């Protein structure tokens, strides 16, 4: 029954500050040091700094020096990490990590490898405010076909914050579905696309509706994805 309990996820506008907590159980907090490691979406782990839980002594990476503050509450076996003057690049998952052994590393004491970790705390740095998505279709046609199969979809654009829960035909359609991961745009609003591969031959008789649910704005968008219609028909 040895774990590290972290505080909930957060959204902060640039230039603000976030204070992530990390409570400890199953061991003597004062006997070990507490480290903080971050991971930006689709990037490597980045070491930030540590706190000696028994004496309150800290050490930080020079990359964060001036913006990071690490504290500990011996009375509640909790460690805190404060990240000031938040920028777009600070959007990451923040983990508190405890090394395998007690004390401080140094010559003949190489202890900076961690066995106990917290689940993580996502901190999203965005000036953007809550916005419901716009849903546009990715209409199937002969130009979307391959071996009797046709591709169709939904472009879920400009929403904040994550997530959007996307289903097809109110759960009746599950096979052949590819819901792509969200991408943070230049505007600071997420965009996403959900595609499905269906039989090409039944495009005129089947109905394909994507159900886009966004709980933060209390917005639900149902879009019918029909085959490519023509404004005009021509020759020469």
């Amino acid at each position: 029954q040895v774990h590290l309990v972290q505080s909930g996820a957060e959204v902060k506008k640039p230039g603000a500050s976030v204070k992530v907590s990390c409570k400890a159980s199953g061991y003597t907090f004062t006997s070990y040091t507490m480290h903080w490691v971050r991971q930006a979406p689709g990037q490597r782990l980045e070491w930030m700094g540590w706190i000696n839980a028994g004496h309150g002594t800290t050490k930080y990476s020079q990359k964060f020096q001036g913006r990071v503050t690490i504290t500990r509450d011996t009375s509640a076996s909790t460690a805190y990490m404060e990240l000031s003057s938040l920028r777009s690049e600070d959007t990451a998952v923040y983990y508190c990590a405890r090394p395998t052994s007690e004390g401080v590393a140094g010559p003949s004491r190489y202890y900076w490898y961690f066995d106990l970790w917290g689940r993580g705390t996502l901190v999203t740095v965005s000036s953007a405010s809550t916005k419901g998505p716009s849903v546009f279709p990715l209409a199937p046609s002969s130009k979307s076909t391959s071996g009797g199969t046709a591709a169709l979809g939904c472009l879920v654009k400009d929403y904040f914050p994550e997530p959007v829960t996307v289903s097809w035909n109110s759960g009746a359609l599950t096979s052949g579905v590819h819901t792509f991961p969200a991408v943070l745009q230049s505007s600071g609003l997420y965009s996403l696309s959900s595609v499905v591969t269906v039989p090409s031959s039944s495009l005129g008789t089947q109905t394909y509706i994507c159900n886009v649910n966004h709980k933060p704005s209390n917005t639900k968008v149902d879009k019918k994805v029909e085959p490519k219609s023509c404004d005009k028909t021509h020759t020469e």
């Binding site: 190489y110 202890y111 900076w112 279709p137 591709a151 979809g153 472009l155 595609v195």
Partner: protein, 213 residues
């Protein structure tokens, strides 16, 4: 700082087989190297420390070796749960403690060419400010492919975004989506809109296009 290079970027290994993962350092790390297992949406799990010692409770199929600037992680018999991203960490020099870029170990299968489809922007989006053109490459293998946007034979510079799904649970393929974002009269300027796809699965680059109207 000690620059930790994890090679290859991604490695395709069939189950039951032997998985050999590499980690190099810009300077001597002695025997102060650790290995971590990371599954998507989870905290890293310590596997190896002291370059070769196994963390308590870690099953015996996991092992490590090396010293100085070159290291190796070995998974003698690769299981189902074993498919994850692997990170190497140095703890010889601090600050800063550095980790490697990671190696994603995927399940192996045959070379599958992508189904390439191009989607024009809808009238509904065109009625608004922005115009989004989507290039879809679905159910392909291997993961690495190159989607290039071409509008009136002119290449596109940082005018698009892309995302890839996690390897399929049944046919272990990948799907990629690339969105070329414009506006009006940016989209109303040009006629031909296309996406050129370079992949292992086919001889020449696959070009799919459409003309505005």
């Amino acid at each position: 700082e000690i620059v930790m290079t994890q090679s290859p970027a991604t490695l395709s290994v069939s189950p039951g087989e032997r998985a050999t993962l590499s980690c190099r350092a810009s300077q001597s790390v002695s025997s102060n190297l650790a290995w971590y297992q990371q599954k998507p949406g989870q905290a890293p799990r310590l596997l190896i420390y002291g370059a070769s010692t196994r963390a308590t409770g870690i099953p015996a199929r996991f092992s490590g070796s090396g010293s100085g600037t070159e290291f190796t992680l070995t998974i003698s018999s690769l299981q189902s749960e074993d498919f994850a991203v692997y990170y190497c960490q140095q703890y010889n020099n601090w600050p800063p403690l550095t980790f490697g870029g990671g190696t994603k170990v995927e399940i192996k299968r045959t070379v599958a060419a992508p189904s390439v489809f191009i989607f024009p922007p809808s009238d509904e989006q065109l009625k608004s400010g922005t115009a989004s053109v989507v290039c879809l490459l679905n159910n392909f293998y291997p993961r690495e492919a190159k989607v290039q946007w071409k509008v009136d034979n002119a290449l596109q510079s940082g005018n698009s975004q892309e995302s890839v799904t996690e390897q399929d649970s049944k046919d272990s393929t990948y799907s990629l989506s690339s969105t070329l974002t414009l506006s009006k009269a940016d989209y109303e300027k040009h006629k031909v809109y296309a996406c050129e796809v370079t992949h292992e699965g086919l001889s020449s680059p696959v070009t799919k296009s459409f003309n505005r109207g």
